[PDB]
């Protein structure tokens, strides 16, 4: 019951999913052949959340994979746990977008999306009670940031009451791999605010910083960043698949973390994270988890959370632990940092406990906090956008496929209005 379907688009989203599904399968004891080989009874009670049942007793994820080029899905199939995905759900084009948002949203993405919407509708109509959808995509690419966001609007138009999740990677100015990143980032943020019920920003720069400083491993690769993102993704829905002292589905988090409908851009972090050589030194206790949870360097975004004030915060503890300690520590982390918490909403931290810890760990915490410090990312994105747009650089590529500069002006104005009205509440006082 109350299950969700997985939809991913683009190369970055496909690579994120290729590790997210591996993590989920390892958590539920599903072999790469789809056969259950788990140890505990609880591993099968709520498997309908992510997995479907077919004849022969094997399980198949309800994931939908889409891209405008076939290479990435032809590569993910040969990887581990690549056989679980149903071949029918693979939809792809023969041309690609070339990191051009217009091509992936107006000319090419519009004709292809009917086939993927057909299978999306097939998956949603069938399921017992829908909880919602979760979306993984990147804002630094053309086909992803175009087709995914248009699909968001199409899904929202047909299921207005369901919940919608988006895990979005925004292009940081530090590690830049594409010159046309500001254009399709700014165009995508315009559409994303209007339809997504929840959005979670993730930055490659913050992932590299975490890998270099906390884990202290010499050579980070995309596999480590994907693993961290996958652990963070799994931590959110853990209590929906396992029993606990205070169950809290996604809708309950939506109620408690979004004060106003347009303020739904969160930054997350996962604890504990320790190096291989120091994993024996540390002792896992609730104070040790909560001190690392609120650490500024532990956030999955380069945004500095002590440059603003938290509107609200959430924590999803895992493992068996006493609730009194959790509540007193949450109170203590809020009394010692009163300057960084907005004062006109008292008791702005939500907590939840799940009795099933991750495989290999005795305690774990997932942190989701809505803070005013996120304005800095939109500020720098808009700064680069307006630095590049004033000369109409690279504009002809977009304008040759039916798009105009008016949609750029409206997007810039709406993004600046969002930036302004997000900080409006930072200076608000009672």
């Amino acid at each position: 019951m109350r299950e969700i379907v997985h939809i991913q688009g683009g190369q970055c989203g496909n690579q994120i999913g290729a590790k997210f599904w591996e993590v989920i399968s390892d958590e539920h004891g599903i072999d790469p052949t789809g056969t259950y080989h788990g140890d505990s009874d609880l591993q099968l009670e709520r498997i309908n959340v992510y997995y479907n049942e077919a004849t022969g007793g094997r399980y198949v994820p309800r994931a939908i994979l889409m891209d405008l080029e076939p290479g990435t899905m032809d590569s993910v199939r040969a990887g581990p746990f690549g056989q679980l995905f149903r071949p029918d759900n693979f939809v792809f084009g023969q041309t690609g977008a070339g990191n051009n948002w217009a091509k992936g949203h107006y000319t090419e993405g519009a004709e292809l999306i009917d086939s993927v919407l057909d299978v999306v509708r097939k998956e949603a109509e069938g399921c017992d009670c829908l909880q919602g959808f979760q979306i993984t995509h990147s804002l630094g690419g053309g086909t992803g940031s175009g087709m995914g966001t248009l699909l968001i609007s199409k899904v929202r138009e047909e299921y207005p009451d369901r919940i919608m999740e988006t895990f979005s990677v925004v292009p940081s100015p530090k590690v830049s791999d594409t010159v046309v990143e500001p254009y399709n980032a700014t165009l995508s943020v315009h559409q994303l605010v209007e339809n997504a019920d929840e959005c979670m920003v993730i930055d490659n720069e913050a992932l590299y910083d975490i890998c270099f400083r906390t884990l202290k491993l010499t050579t980070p690769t995309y596999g480590d960043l994907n693993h961290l993102v996958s652990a963070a993704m799994s931590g959110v829905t853990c209590c929906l698949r396992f029993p606990g002292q205070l169950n809290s589905d996604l809708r309950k988090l939506a109620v408690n973390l979004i004060p106003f409908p347009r303020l739904h851009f969160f930054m997350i972090g996962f604890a504990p994270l320790t190096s291989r050589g120091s994993q024996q030194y540390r002792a896992l206790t609730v104070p040790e988890l909560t001190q690392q949870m609120f650490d500024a360097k532990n956030m999955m975004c380069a945004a500095d959370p002590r440059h603003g004030r938290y509107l609200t915060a959430s924590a999803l503890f895992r493992g068996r632990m006493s609730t009194k300690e959790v509540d007193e520590q949450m109170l203590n982390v809020q009394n010692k940092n009163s300057s960084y918490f907005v004062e006109w909403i008292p008791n702005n931290i939500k907590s939840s406990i799940c009795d099933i810890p991750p495989k290999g760990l005795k305690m774990a915490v997932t942190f989701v906090g809505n803070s005013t410090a996120i304005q800095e990312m939109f500020k720098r994105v808009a700064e680069q956008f307006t630095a590049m747009f004033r000369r109409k650089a690279f504009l002809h590529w977009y304008t040759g496929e039916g798009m105009d500069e008016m949609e750029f002006t409206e997007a810039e104005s709406n993004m600046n209005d969002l930036v302004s009205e997000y900080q409006q509440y930072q200076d608000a006082t009672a």
Binding site: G98, V179, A387
Partner: protein, 430 residues
């Protein structure tokens, strides 16, 4: 399901095509007979049982080079009737190969192009090679580009033209046809890469330590650059780049698409292994002005956008840590309206070595394609050379008597003046 067709016209074009086609056959394990003793599909086609046929066509009016090809070790590889050959050479006269003898040959080439294109299903684009300072090369390249631009339309075409050196020259009349061909491909080619011989001679002398190089050594380096550019289409990589993802990242405006390339490392086996060849040092060497593949000084102008490809065991974090260092340096400055200008690609397959060649085997390499404002100097010096002889109307009778009109020389001069004014207008800060 992704394909590309390479066009070779003229003596220089055929001699660099031979150079790239030993390298591709060696890299995909195909013997010179065409027989193997799913990545080949980008350049080759399967015949059903046994041999592979290149997706390439060789053009020339002068039969000597084609006859040399049809008797060498590669006689069995190419299809016998795609090596189109003429009888009479254009003899460095541009008007000949555009108005007199090229028209009767161009129809067969277009028929061959159609017969090759109907086989491909996912055609990415065309590649063309031609030495500009010759009659048949420049004239037939212009005519083929003009026919293809209307037969196919929006398909992407890439031109690896070899402009004459600043002072070193083999002919005496090459500025005329160089200017005319630049006129022709200015409004007809999506990408043009600079390849003059003097810079590559200096590269060989300084790094490879060869004091008596021949054309084969130059063509092998060009072939390595081509392989590095197209590796991302036929090998798995952490950060892929497609051909169609260029005009959205390197071409700010439709007129400006001339850029100059560089490659690193270039080193011989006698002293290669004594140093570690870290990613930082190779990416520093790639940006050195003395390692430009065209004899132009980047210190004399701004950068617009840099697209640079890695291959081997490089890790993205090391790439970011090196892009930061380059942004730090005060001798390299980017244009004002471009905050980020780097597009990064990472591939896993290390560069392949050709036996008996110059380059050694290494695990890391970098190839950069950079668009800069300093390129206007070659246009200015070619224009100055053209004006000196056009003042007295020297050598014009060799062109007027081959069907070309008198006024055709002036409008190419006007288009070059327009291009030079445009390059100055773009490079000024706001």
């Amino acid at each position: 399901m992704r394909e590309v067709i390479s066009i070779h016209v003229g003596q220089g074009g055929i001699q660099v095509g031979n150079a790239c086609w030993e390298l591709f056959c060696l890299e995909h394990g195909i013997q010179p007979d065409g027989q193997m003793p799913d990545a080949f599909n980008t350049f080759f086609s399967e015949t059903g049982a046994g041999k592979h046929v290149p997706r390439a066509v060789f053009l020339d009016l002068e039969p000597t080079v084609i006859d040399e090809v049809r008797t060498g070790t590669y006689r069995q590889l190419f299809h016998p009737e795609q090596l189109i050959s003429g009888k009479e050479d254009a003899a460095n006269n541009f008007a000949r190969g555009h108005y007199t003898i090229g028209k009767e040959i161009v129809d067969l080439c277009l028929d061959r192009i159609r017969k090759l294109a109907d086989n491909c299903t996912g055609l990415q684009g065309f590649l063309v090679f031609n030495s500009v300072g010759g009659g048949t090369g420049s004239g037939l390249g212009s005519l083929l580009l003009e026919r293809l631009s209307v037969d196919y339309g929006k398909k992407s075409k890439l031109g690896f033209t070899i402009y004459p050196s600043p002072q070193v020259s083999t002919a005496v009349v090459e500025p005329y046809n160089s200017i005319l061909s630049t006129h022709s491909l200015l409004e007809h080619t999506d990408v043009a890469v600079m390849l003059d011989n003097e810079a590559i001679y200096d590269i060989c002398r300084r790094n490879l330590d060869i004091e008596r190089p021949t054309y084969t050594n130059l063509n092998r380096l060009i072939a390595q650059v081509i392989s590095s550019l197209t590796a991302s289409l036929r090998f798995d990589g952490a950060l892929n780049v497609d051909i169609t993802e260029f005009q959205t990242n390197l071409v700010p405006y439709p007129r400006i698409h001339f850029m100059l390339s560089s490659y690193a490392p270039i080193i011989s086996a006698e002293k290669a292994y004594h140093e570690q060849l870290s990613v930082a040092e190779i990416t520093n060497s790639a940006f050195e002005p003395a390692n430009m593949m065209a004899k132009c000084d980047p210190r004399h102008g701004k950068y617009m956008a840099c697209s640079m490809m890695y291959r081997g065991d490089v890790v993205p974090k090391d790439v970011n840590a090196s892009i930061a260092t380059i942004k730090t340096k005060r001798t390299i400055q980017f244009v004002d309206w471009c905050p980020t200008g780097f597009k990064v690609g990472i591939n896993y397959q290390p560069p392949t070595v050709v036996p008996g060649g110059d380059l050694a085997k290494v695990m890391r390499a970098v190839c950069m394609i950079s668009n800069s404002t300093a390129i206007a100097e070659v246009f200015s010096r070619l224009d100055h050379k053209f004006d000196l002889m056009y003042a007295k109307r020297a050598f014009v009778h060799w062109y007027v008597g081959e069907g070309m009109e008198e006024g055709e020389f002036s409008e190419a001069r006007e288009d070059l003046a327009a291009l030079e004014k445009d390059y100055e207008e773009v490079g000024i800060e706001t």
